[PDB]
């Protein structure tokens, strides 16, 4: 079969349930902290310590 016949490649299952929703929720946390850092250094800023 290694020369004559052929096959088909789908190649991406990735269906690991808890791992999937870990990916999604971790990404949501990322976008949270990203926009936080952005408007953090963007707008009027007051701190918790001095100069953070």
């Amino acid at each position: 079969x290694x020369x004559x016949x052929x096959x088909x490649x789908x190649x991406x299952x990735x269906x690991x349930y808890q791992v999937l929703r870990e990916k999604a929720a971790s990404q949501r946390r990322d976008v949270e902290r990203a926009l936080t850092r952005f408007m953090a250094k963007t707008g009027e800023t007051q701190s918790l310590f001095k100069d953070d």
């Binding site: 971790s26 990404q27 949501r28 990322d30 976008v31 949270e32 990203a34 926009l35 850092r37 952005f38 408007m39 250094k41 963007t42």
Partner: protein, 257 residues
């Protein structure tokens, strides 16, 4: 959800508005993002179509904004940029095109600043010629058909020379060396004849600047540094002896270590 387009909203609005600290802070934001993707498809799509807009609109400030945006996309050590690169590469190289349709004067040097963008090109290909090997062949054929022909404006020739320049060493050694002298004669025809195409005049002038002050070191390696006037004879006069003078400068820069 919501925060997707929230983040998208304010980072595009900072990408367009000229709040310069917020500008640079958005750039360092994108550069320092753990796990900013899935915004990436909409991101790049915006980049492509805003490029087309500002091609039609000829707003150089938005152009350097988008180029810094691409630079920031490049500098994530998380962003597997791969599958989307086919949108950036037009959006890159079309910025190395446009039909001289801004105002002239300073834009020439801003054309030079678009060569900054050409730096990005090499900073693409080093990470992305990993293909069923496609990318470098594609871009170099593109620059080749750019570089060879006539009916080729100074925007086109200038930026193509710039992109090959950013591709580096043996690109210049193999590809720019041959019709070096012929395009030097093209500029010599731009020289010494008519006067009032000063777009084209100063265009070819900082073309000469690109050629000399990028193409010196490969000849400094190859051609041994006697015979300045003969090197002018060996490389059509005009680059010499500033070819050899810049070669002396480059040998000094090498010996400075």
């Amino acid at each position: 959800s919501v925060e997707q387009q929230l983040y998208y909203k304010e980072i595009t609005e900072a990408c367009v508005g000229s709040c310069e600290a917020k500008r640079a802070e958005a750039l360092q934001s994108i550069a320092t993002d753990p796990g900013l993707y899935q915004m990436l498809p909409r991101f790049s799509t915006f980049i492509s179509e805003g490029v087309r807009v500002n091609v039609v609109q000829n707003n150089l400030a938005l152009l350097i904004y988008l180029m810094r945006m691409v630079k920031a996309l490049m500098d994530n050590p998380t962003l597997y940029l791969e599958k989307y690169v086919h949108e950036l590469i037009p959006a890159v190289m079309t910025c190395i095109v446009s039909r001289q349709l801004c105002l002239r004067p300073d834009v020439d040097n801003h054309w030079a600043l678009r060569d900054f963008a050409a730096r990005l090109v090499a900073q693409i290909c080093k990470h992305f010629s990993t293909t069923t090997n496609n990318i470098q062949s594609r871009i170099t054929k593109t620059f080749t058909k750019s570089w060879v022909d006539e009916k080729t404006p100074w925007t086109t020739r200038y930026g193509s020379i710039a992109g090959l320049a950013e591709l580096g060493h043996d690109v210049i050694k193999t590809l720019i060396l041959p019709r070096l002298q012929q395009e030097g004669e093209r500029i010599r025809s731009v020289l010494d004849g008519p006067v009032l195409s000063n777009i084209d005049r100063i265009g070819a002038d900082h073309v000469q600047s690109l050629l000399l002050k990028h193409c010196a070191p490969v000849l400094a390696k190859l051609r041994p540094p006697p015979d300045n006037q003969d090197a002018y004879r060996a490389e059509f006069g005009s680059l010499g002896p500033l070819l050899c003078s810049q070669v002396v400068k480059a040998r000094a820069q090498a010996a400075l270590q």
